[PDB]
Ligand binder design. Sequence first.
Ligand SMILES: CC(=O)N1CCC[C@](O)(C(=O)O)C1
Ligand SMILES: [Zn+2]
Ligand SMILES: [Zn+2]
Ligand SMILES: [Zn+2]
Length: 585
Amino acid sequence: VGACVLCNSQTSLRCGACIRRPFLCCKCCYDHVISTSHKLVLSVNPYVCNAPGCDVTDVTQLYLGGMSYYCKSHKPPISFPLCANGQVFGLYKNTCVGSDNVTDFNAIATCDWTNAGDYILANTCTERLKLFAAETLKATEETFKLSYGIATVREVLSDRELHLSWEVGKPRPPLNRNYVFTGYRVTKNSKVQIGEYTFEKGAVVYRGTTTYKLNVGDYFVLTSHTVMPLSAPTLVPQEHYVRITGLYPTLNISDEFSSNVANYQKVGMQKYSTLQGPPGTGKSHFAIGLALYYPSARIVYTACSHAAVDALCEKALKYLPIDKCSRIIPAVECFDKFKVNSTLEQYVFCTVNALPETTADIVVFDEISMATNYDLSVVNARLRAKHYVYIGDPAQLPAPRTLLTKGTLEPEYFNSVCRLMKTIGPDMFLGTCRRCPAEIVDTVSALVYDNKLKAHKDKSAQCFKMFYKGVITHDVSSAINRPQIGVVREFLTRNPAWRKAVFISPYNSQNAVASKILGLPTQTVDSSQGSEYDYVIFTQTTETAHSCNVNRFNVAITRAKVGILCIMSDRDLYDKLQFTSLEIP
Ligand SMILES: CC(=O)N1CCC[C@](O)(C(=O)O)C1
Ligand SMILES: [Zn+2]
Ligand SMILES: [Zn+2]
Ligand SMILES: [Zn+2]
């Protein structure tokens, strides 16, 4: 028994073809089964024919005869059909309201999540369907990981290098950081974990969580977890107040945080607030400063990634009493300078998926572009707070969508929070970039921030752009542009100071080739998000939707503190770069 995800109507029916098995009311369960291929219906029991060796599960072909269920062929003389009168049969038959359209729930229940349209709907549908879609997608995501073949260590060529043998008649996952494996040792009568791992083409390179002397017969699977059901909404109901509520501002504040005093008062004057923090505008400075402005306030700092939480811990270590901070870790190497797993500490730093059930004066949820509606609901379900602050930049990168192939996902569709920030705008905006030379601020201000991002620094005069298509080669799941690496190699012979540069590209294989030929440290745009370097060399590599995604480009070129060389493929973004042009040698 439970609640009808379309009506709320109390019901004893869940669709058994739906991977989540959502409770549906007589009217909603019926309208669902007759308009789609879903025909298995679950109650206190499953509406299946209880006859001996009969394979009827379709609820439109089944009858209640006695207190058992039968098809047409096996039914007793006295029966009624399970599924007639525009309704399906269970408990609470007389309480049931229905819907004028069931169209959105059917599409959510039946899509394979390969089309952008599927994510657009999951983000514009009613709130209760946002949860259903968030669960349904995540389960589809964790199941798709099972479809991948096991990889087995056939030979240990060296340290940090292997020869893999792959399961037959199953696809092989891409070998990039977005696919984290889990090793396993071959025991008497089972298997035991041996750290998480990643792989990249050579034989294969492997960068594992822990070090070992792993040997033949050891194997690797992408560990998938149980997806729990969602109760709480993605955003609580908004409330605007006329005074600061439940929070007592400080009388003395330092000139370090004085620029955020207006913004921190806004935080106290509404239930939830969005802060768009572009690159190097001071998001974590803002987050920690909130603690100093409201000194007695209990604050849970949360983000999706360990990295994101740890960076909040680093900043907190510089400004807040260590004895008042705690890092929550579930029983990967993260921050270890606070007492571990102390829920009742004033300042609690913890990933979304590890949150305890607790209350707080303020909740800060950082790197919000990376959040899914699933994460949004979980936080609302674990944390009951006087105030909620969402910090991020919908102009930066989202959580990768492993199933998406048709269409681009626009930032207004990354999650409920990014949708608000792109439709009504963000409550607060950090308008001054401290990190990047002016040529780079001017470029991304126009490109994705509506000319509202201002440069601290001056022109560096060390921002260059070269238009060079070169030659694109493809391997199993990535792109390589060797002539673009060549152009960079020639550039470093004539400009050897740039040998301190980080190499960035949109492709892990480009990076692996660039690492051999150049010896620069390498990052995917996607791994570079939240890091800064004095000097950045960027090869676009292709003109795909992937290498031209304006959020990706935004992150690529805002990594640079001093200078950047951009070797471009796309005539569009090249022409948008407010950088010095260089001829091809
Ligand atoms: C769609 C696409 O081409 N991608 C996103 C996933 C990683 C990637 O395959 C790579 O790093 O090679 C690039
Ligand atoms: Zn269904
Ligand atoms: Zn219903
Ligand atoms: Zn039967």
